[PDB]
Structure 1
Amino acid sequence: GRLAGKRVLLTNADAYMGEATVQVFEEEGAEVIADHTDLTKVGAAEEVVERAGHIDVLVANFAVDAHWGVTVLETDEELWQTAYETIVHPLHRICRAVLPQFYERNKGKIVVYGSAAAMRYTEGALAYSTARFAQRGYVTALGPEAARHNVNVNFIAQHWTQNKEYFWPERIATDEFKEDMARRVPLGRLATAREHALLALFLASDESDFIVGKSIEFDGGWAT
């Protein structure tokens, strides 16, 4: 298996892209520590890591309501803060928590499950977009720093991928959705969650040691 003998800490394992990651990574021989801890709590990240034991791979899987269609003037203080609390501050907490053991072993893997809203204008998702931009910045800044210790940090910039938070079954079923998707997505279809996990698998495996601090657009061509 491509992750044989590896132990993978997956945050918010039932949220966002976690379910397909469990399936694919376990098929490939990984032991997946499927964590559900609320990492918006200061100190929670360090406790998760202490309890996990030996970690080879951190999958930083965070999601928050995009509030599709909410305008800049409707983006009130609470909606804005919730975006940062939910997917930005926990990212640094969990990465800072895992890095010491990575540095000790001069080896580690971090895959951040981000969004193409961190790459290009995404209509009607202002606060969410800026929070994903901050995550992208985290990978851009941490990646080259951690690479000195043979640690890979990379960012999957997904869009048009099936999940509960952004492309849930009721939303993607309408003719209106399908028409817009055909206009905007060159490949003309949504990604499956398994397809996302296969990219994550590459970035989590030792097949990708030379990829550092990169944002890989997983969007059917949307941001091209």
Structure 2
Amino acid sequence: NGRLAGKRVLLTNADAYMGEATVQVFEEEGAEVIADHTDLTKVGAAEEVVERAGHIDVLVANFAVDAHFGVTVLETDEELWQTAYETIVHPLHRICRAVLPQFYERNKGKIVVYGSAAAMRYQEGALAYSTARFAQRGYVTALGPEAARHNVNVNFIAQHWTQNKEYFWPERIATDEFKEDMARRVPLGRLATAREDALLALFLASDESDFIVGKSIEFDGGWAT
């Protein structure tokens, strides 16, 4: 059988960010993927999504927001700042808090967060976004060891240079300027495919990774090494 045989996976914002490749990889490995499209910025929405989903073995916390490439600290206004937190930080705790009771009842569970390498090292021109990804990384760091006492794994994929619409859309990655910047800063010298990212998520969602607790795994071609 497949590496997620029998498992049911709740995927947030399934059309956005890394959702499409998650569905493809996880379904090929036998999982039933609940592809949710609910806006989890609404208070109370997370508990409703979880109640409607039924039995959940794996939560894939898939959240993204415009990074506002090139916007400076002085141009990072109140609304831009707040929107980073409203979009990817507060919903992360809402959805995790909603799924953890059934994980705790069964003394088993899996949470995979698609995050950012901007939560690990300086990424130029993405200030509010970086701080919000740091907050996500902190949530995994703080919740991870707490949830591990209930045999629940929580882990953070610190991705960069990976194909997606929000940060590496086809038009952006085609220019000469982008290509020279990627060759300078990415040791592997290429972008990751979305599938490669979902293959790491697959490892972290599977029962092959039970000993990995509260970790940030840098998925960035060597950028932050």
**Deviations 1:18-70 (CA, angstroms, capped at 9, x unpaired):** 00000000000000000000000000000000000000000000000000000
> Secondary structure in 1 aligned to 2:68?
coil
> Secondary structure in 2 aligned to 1:145?
helix
**Deviations 1:160-191 (CA, angstroms, capped at 9, x unpaired):** 00000000000000000000000000000000
Q: Distance in 2 between matches of 1:221 and 1:14?
A: 28
**How far is 1:119 from its partner?**
0.2
Q: Distance in 2 between matches of 1:112 and 1:179?
A: 30
Q: Distance in 1 between matches of 2:94 and 2:19?
A: 19
Q: Distance in 1 between matches of 2:102 and 2:121?
A: 34
Q: Distance in 1 between matches of 2:203 and 2:35?
A: 19
**Deviations 1:73-131 (CA, angstroms, capped at 9, x unpaired):** 00000000000000000000000000000000000000000000000000000000000
Work out the percentage of aligned pairs sharing the same amino acid.
99
The match for 1:193 is: 194
> Secondary structure in 1 aligned to 2:111?
strand
Q: Distance in 1 between matches of 2:168 and 2:175?
A: 12
Q: Distance in 2 between matches of 1:74 and 1:117?
A: 19
**Deviations 1:143-163 (CA, angstroms, capped at 9, x unpaired):** 000000000000000000000
Q: Distance in 2 between matches of 1:98 and 1:177?
A: 40
The total of aligned residue pairs comes to: 224
Q: Distance in 1 between matches of 2:63 and 2:220?
A: 18
**Deviations 1:175-224 (CA, angstroms, capped at 9, x unpaired):** 00000000000000000000000000000000000000000000000000
Unaligned regions of 5+ residues in structure 2, if any? none
Q: Distance in 2 between matches of 1:159 and 1:11?
A: 20
Q: Distance in 1 between matches of 2:157 and 2:15?
A: 18
> Secondary structure in 1 aligned to 2:115?
strand
Q: Distance in 2 between matches of 1:176 and 1:124?
A: 16
> Secondary structure in 2 aligned to 1:208?
coil
> Secondary structure in 1 aligned to 2:207?
coil
Q: Distance in 1 between matches of 2:66 and 2:118?
A: 13
Q: Distance in 2 between matches of 1:75 and 1:160?
A: 23
Q: Distance in 2 between matches of 1:6 and 1:107?
A: 12
TM-score, length basis structure 2: 0.99
Q: Distance in 2 between matches of 1:2 and 1:151?
A: 18
The match for 2:168 is: 167
TM-score, length basis structure 1: 1.00
Q: Distance in 2 between matches of 1:160 and 1:7?
A: 29
Unaligned regions of 5+ residues in structure 1, if any? none
Q: Distance in 1 between matches of 2:163 and 2:70?
A: 19
Moved over 2 A (4+): none
